[PDB]
Amino acid sequence: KKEVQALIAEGIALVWESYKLDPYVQRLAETVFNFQEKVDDLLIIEEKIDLEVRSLETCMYDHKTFSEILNRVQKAVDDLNLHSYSNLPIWVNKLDMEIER
Amino acid sequence: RCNVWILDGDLYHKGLLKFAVSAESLPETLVIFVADMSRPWTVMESLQKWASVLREHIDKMKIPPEKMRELERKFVKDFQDYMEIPVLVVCTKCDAVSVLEKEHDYRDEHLDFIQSHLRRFCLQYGAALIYTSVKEEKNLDLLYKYIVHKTYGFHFTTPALVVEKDAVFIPAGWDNEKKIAILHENFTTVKPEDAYEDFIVKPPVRKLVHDKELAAEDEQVFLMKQQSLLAKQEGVLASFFNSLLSK
Amino acid sequence: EGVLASFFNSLLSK
Amino acid sequence: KLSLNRQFFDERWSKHRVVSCLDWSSQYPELLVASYNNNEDAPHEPDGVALVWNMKYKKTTPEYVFHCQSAVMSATFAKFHPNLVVGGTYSGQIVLWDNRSNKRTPVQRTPLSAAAHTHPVYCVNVVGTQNAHNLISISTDGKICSWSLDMLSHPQDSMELVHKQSKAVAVTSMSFPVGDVNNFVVGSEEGSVYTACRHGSKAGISEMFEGHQGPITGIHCHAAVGAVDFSHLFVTSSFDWTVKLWTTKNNKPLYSFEDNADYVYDVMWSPTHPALFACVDGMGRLDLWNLNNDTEVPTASISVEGNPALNRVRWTHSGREIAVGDSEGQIVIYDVGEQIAVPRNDEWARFGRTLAEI
Amino acid sequence: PELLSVIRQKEKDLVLAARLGKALLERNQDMSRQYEQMHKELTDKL
Amino acid sequence: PELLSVIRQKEKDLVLAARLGKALLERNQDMSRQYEQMHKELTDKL
Amino acid sequence: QLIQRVKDDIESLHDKFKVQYPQSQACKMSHVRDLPPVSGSIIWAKQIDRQLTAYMKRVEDVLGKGWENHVEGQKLKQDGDSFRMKLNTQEIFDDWARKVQQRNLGVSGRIFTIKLKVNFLPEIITLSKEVRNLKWLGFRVPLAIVNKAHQANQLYPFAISLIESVRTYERTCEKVEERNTISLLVAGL
Structure with a gap:
């Protein structure tokens, strides 16, 4: 969201006659598509993490079942790490405390 | 067989101590306090922490004052009668002294400092100090013999060793301020009365300081800001060449 | 930079 | 098919110790010397250990045991002195063990002076004829020293290895061609493979071979001898997840075999089959590549139990049995199947044709 | 003597090197400023 | 002897200053080269 | 089929890199072969980078241009770029250089x-070894570090x-002292 607000901040200064309008339209179009795609993936990725963390409450009290749930939660966090969504350490810590509870 | 009770380091489980020592089992119990020599800087802080915890535990027991004074008299009689409840301080990972020489530039003065501190604490609580190394298997048999002697009343014959840095052993009653004064002779920068923390420093471990939370501006404030924007629209070389110019 | 190079060459020769 | 034959492992000695090198004796093929490194946990135990195991008997314990003050990183039977076992050390000091003597301590030991080795000595080997032979040793500082087995106090010859005028070559492995006592090939930590000459007007490094983008772990020249002369070829195995076949003629890799998913630690040509070699991976996989049968996949593959990292591999002199040494220090021997080990009579011309295809 | 003549020749070389280096340093700084300024002109022109 | 010693010290100062001046000349040259390249490219684009 | 296989391969590479270097078997076996630790980490990351390059080239061959x-x-390229962003080892070299310059060791x-x-x-x-490998790895080691390693x-x-x-002299002295009788004869040496 920081980048898109920067690109939109760039566009407020331009006028329709600017020769920079050619590269700018492609940049704004491309970045906002990237913003939408990443957000859509995050809504799916966190739903998976939310379903798993609620699964810990109502799973059989055996170590392997508990490990399997956290293994699936760990893989989802690893994909978030690859995409580079910011503030991931702060967010996971909140997820860690709710898992700890 | 001697009951062994190891309490977890967090105070949250200190209330478990009521299931380790009771009024009937208090005199039979021997108290062991661990001191980590891989982390020497916290040793006295940990020792006053755990000793104070033990004092608080004995407070909740509500022993009769006559019985408590009887126990004190028995312990002190065992104390002064020494010739060449119980509390024993055991130092673990003393081999980490070898690390302290290479990583923190320690020397014999610092080791004299910490062991003089430990012997003064043992005098304060009337305890026996011993140095051990499970990695090097140092003083384990000496430990076992002293434990059996102080619990079952078995004999003991090993003398006090206070010359070696990482193998010090001091049975109860041996230590005294006059005897502790020998280490103060080795001091050349510090004094016995100097604070522990100022001389021996707790290292500032470089923990990963999580970065500041970068937050996107809200859409309303961002658009208000954009509306506001829219509406208002080398030396050392010179030193050398001066040096070769003056002459 | 002719004089500069000439002096530097002469000094390198020395 | 590869089949488990014998695990070799001592509770006191090999535990918590990786196998740094293996070697099979020439005259008593049942024997197998294996060196080991320092045990991290127990300082009281000797750093260097070398166990000579015996396949003939069923005894689990080693036939002989030796140890020395510093971690052994190379070990080799003196090829023309059956009573001897030479080994390097991390301290950079050849130690000679006599089996006849009752001393597990080395009987002789090289200096640690400038003339002798000082850096770790990962390559030691006896080269020459029975009438005259020398112990060549190469450290990780490029120093190669000729040594006589009789006397070790003084180096017979000392020279440094260098390329591009002054640049030290950190030799990590070394092999010799069969029957050649002057040319040899040494892999380097730099990833380059150097053909060097022991004596000559250009004594030292003779040629540089590029292509490996990680440190070289294991070099081995061709061992099988038959109608056709394939002495020039040699196989390297490197940390860049590859084995590479080279010839001394060509400055670039003849071929690259990478069906792995980790480092490759040791590769060795089979000593009876011309197109067969074996490479040991970090995932515990021992992979026999027969280049005549198929070239893009291992001909045979077997994984050790527990998936330990496999540091070394050594064929037996017969070629039927292959010993692999793991990080745990267990020396597991495998029996190579009949259809893989023994070659067809036309295997030599067949491998010549496959080389022609490359 | 001859050694004093060598002392003198070294002194001339020393002072020449001093003036040479000082002028070269100031010229380098001036040249960098000129490059940056005209770049700003030329990028603006483009 | 003392004359030779001061000769050695002045020679050390001389070689140091000469190397500094040569390095400054090289930096001057590099400034000229990047000046040439950038001026050619931006003006050629124009 | 081939793109699915390559996706499996890069997934395996992701699994290998997720296991941190000090826990990996490569760290131990590289310590065995006299390789220093920092160079070991950098070399490990460099090989994983090389393999990712190889797999992306496999995809390029399979699907041709574009x-x-x-x-x-598209997913292959995005994941590969994001992964290669984290296979960089510049931070490790910079931290090592900063630490060694902080130590400021010497021999004089x-x-x-x-x-x-x-x-x-x-x-x-070890510093010398740490320099040597780095010089091949393509890092510009600081000049002071290079001089220290050379010395x-x-x-x-x-x-x-x-x-x-x-x-040896100390142990010979102790041997002589344990037998005072031979002390007189060995006075000269």
Whole structure:
């Protein structure tokens, strides 16, 4: 969201006659598509993490079942790490405390 | 067989101590306090922490004052009668002294400092100090013999060793301020009365300081800001060449 | 930079 | 098919110790010397250990045991002195063990002076004829020293290895061609493979071979001898997840075999089959590549139990049995199947044709 | 003597090197400023 | 002897200053080269 | 089929890199072969990077030109770029250089010190190895570090000779002292 607000901040200064309008339209179009795609993936990725963390409450009290749930939660966090969504350490810590509870 | 009770380091489980020592089992119990020599800087802080915890535990027991004074008299009689409840301080990972020489530039003065501190604490609580190394298997048999002697009343014959840095052993009653004064002779920068923390420093471990939370501006404030924007629209070389110019 | 190079060459020769 | 034959492992000695090198004796093929490194946990135990195991008997314990003050990183039977076992050390000091003597301590030991080795000595080997032979040793500082087995106090010859005028070559492995006592090939930590000459007007490094983008772990020249002369070829195995076949003629890799998913630690040509070699991976996989049968996949593959990292591999002199040494220090021997080990009579011309295809 | 003549020749070389280096340093700084300024002109022109 | 010693010290100062001046000349040259390249490219684009 | 297989391969690479280097078997086996630790980490990351390059080239061959914007090549390219962003090892080299410059080790001084000691440490050798591998890895090592490593390499054999001579002399002294009878004869040596 920081980048898109920067690109939109760039566009407020331009006028329709600017020769920079050619590269700018492609940049704004491309970045906002990237913003939408990443957000859509995050809504799916966190739903998976939310379903798993609620699964810990109502799973059989055996170590392997508990490990399997956290293994699936760990893989989802690893994909978030690859995409580079910011503030991931702060967010996971909140997820860690709710898992700890 | 001697009951062994190891309490977890967090105070949250200190209330478990009521299931380790009771009024009937208090005199039979021997108290062991661990001191980590891989982390020497916290040793006295940990020792006053755990000793104070033990004092608080004995407070909740509500022993009769006559019985408590009887126990004190028995312990002190065992104390002064020494010739060449119980509390024993055991130092673990003393081999980490070898690390302290290479990583923190320690020397014999610092080791004299910490062991003089430990012997003064043992005098304060009337305890026996011993140095051990499970990695090097140092003083384990000496430990076992002293434990059996102080619990079952078995004999003991090993003398006090206070010359070696990482193998010090001091049975109860041996230590005294006059005897502790020998280490103060080795001091050349510090004094016995100097604070522990100022001389021996707790290292500032470089923990990963999580970065500041970068937050996107809200859409309303961002658009208000954009509306506001829219509406208002080398030396050392010179030193050398001066040096070769003056002459 | 002719004089500069000439002096530097002469000094390198020395 | 590869089949488990014998695990070799001592509770006191090999535990918590990786196998740094293996070697099979020439005259008593049942024997197998294996060196080991320092045990991290127990300082009281000797750093260097070398166990000579015996396949003939069923005894689990080693036939002989030796140890020395510093971690052994190379070990080799003196090829023309059956009573001897030479080994390097991390301290950079050849130690000679006599089996006849009752001393597990080395009987002789090289200096640690400038003339002798000082850096770790990962390559030691006896080269020459029975009438005259020398112990060549190469450290990780490029120093190669000729040594006589009789006397070790003084180096017979000392020279440094260098390329591009002054640049030290950190030799990590070394092999010799069969029957050649002057040319040899040494892999380097730099990833380059150097053909060097022991004596000559250009004594030292003779040629540089590029292509490996990680440190070289294991070099081995061709061992099988038959109608056709394939002495020039040699196989390297490197940390860049590859084995590479080279010839001394060509400055670039003849071929690259990478069906792995980790480092490759040791590769060795089979000593009876011309197109067969074996490479040991970090995932515990021992992979026999027969280049005549198929070239893009291992001909045979077997994984050790527990998936330990496999540091070394050594064929037996017969070629039927292959010993692999793991990080745990267990020396597991495998029996190579009949259809893989023994070659067809036309295997030599067949491998010549496959080389022609490359 | 001859050694004093060598002392003198070294002194001339020393002072020449001093003036040479000082002028070269100031010229380098001036040249960098000129490059940056005209770049700003030329990028603006483009 | 003392004359030779001061000769050695002045020679050390001389070689140091000469190397500094040569390095400054090289930096001057590099400034000229990047000046040439950038001026050619931006003006050629124009 | 081939793109699915390559996706499996890069997934395996992701699994290998997720297992941190000090826990990996590569770290232990690289320590075995005299490789220093920082160089080991950098080398490990470099090989994983090389393999990712190889797999992306496999995809490019499979799908031909324009694989960056293909239906199955787009996800491949995005994941590969994001992964290669984190395979960079510049931070490790920078941290090592900063730490070593902070230590500011050296060799200058008297050769002996007072039991007899040789003013030289084994750890100084590791720095030299840490330089050597790095010089091949393509990092520009600082000049002061290079000079320190060169001095360490130059003086290491002589330092070892002095240490070994001192140790042998001390043990010979102890042997002579345990038998006072031979002390008189060995006075000259």
